[PDB]
């Protein structure tokens, strides 16, 4: 998911 590390 975008923005997750």
């Amino acid at each position: 998911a975008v923005g997750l590390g």
Partner: antibody
Amino acid sequence: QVQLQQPGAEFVKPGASVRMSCKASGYTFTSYWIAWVKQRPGQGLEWIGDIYPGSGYTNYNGKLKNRATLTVDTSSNTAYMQLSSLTSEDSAVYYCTRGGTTFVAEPWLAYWGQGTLVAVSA
Amino acid sequence: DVVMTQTALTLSVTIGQPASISCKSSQSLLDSDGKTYLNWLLQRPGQSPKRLIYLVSKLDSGVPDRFTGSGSGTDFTLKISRVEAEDLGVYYCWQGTHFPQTFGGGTRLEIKR
């Protein structure tokens, strides 16, 4: 309450640069991504890029070809977008929107600014 | 990138009657953590986009029960049981499962006459 405040309009000449601001309030500024979304007058929404205010980590859309630069000022809770070498194809409304955190993606696009109209003209 | 196709470029609706629009993606939106990051937004004329549904079927604070999101994998639908005047505008689907994030082209709801 969570709010993102944007100037109403910016006027810029062709070949020049513009700088737009998004002042955040009502939450921990450094914990949520800030995304920038472009909308041409009769068209749909396009992601331009986003920035994580905690570190200043940036993502850009390839279609700008390294003309957009995103920054944050943690002391004023303000995110900035700069666009260089403007042509008429950059005439559009640019929206501030708040993303998720680095741990949860659920809040993505939950809050929007009122948008900044950018008109490119000599 | 992930292509999001919105079906019904324009849907002519009647107040008090149902409406249904669909969003198809060129890839599965199911993320490795089990969730599907599909949002629906409404942009009323002159307004900023507003989020109605996240996480294919979850309603945002204040969104009336008449809205229902559904779907799985690549095929998703937004439904309104009875359309009201405040529902007219352009509806956008969005995906945050795959980088880069993408928006659908949009479906406009307008009054039939």
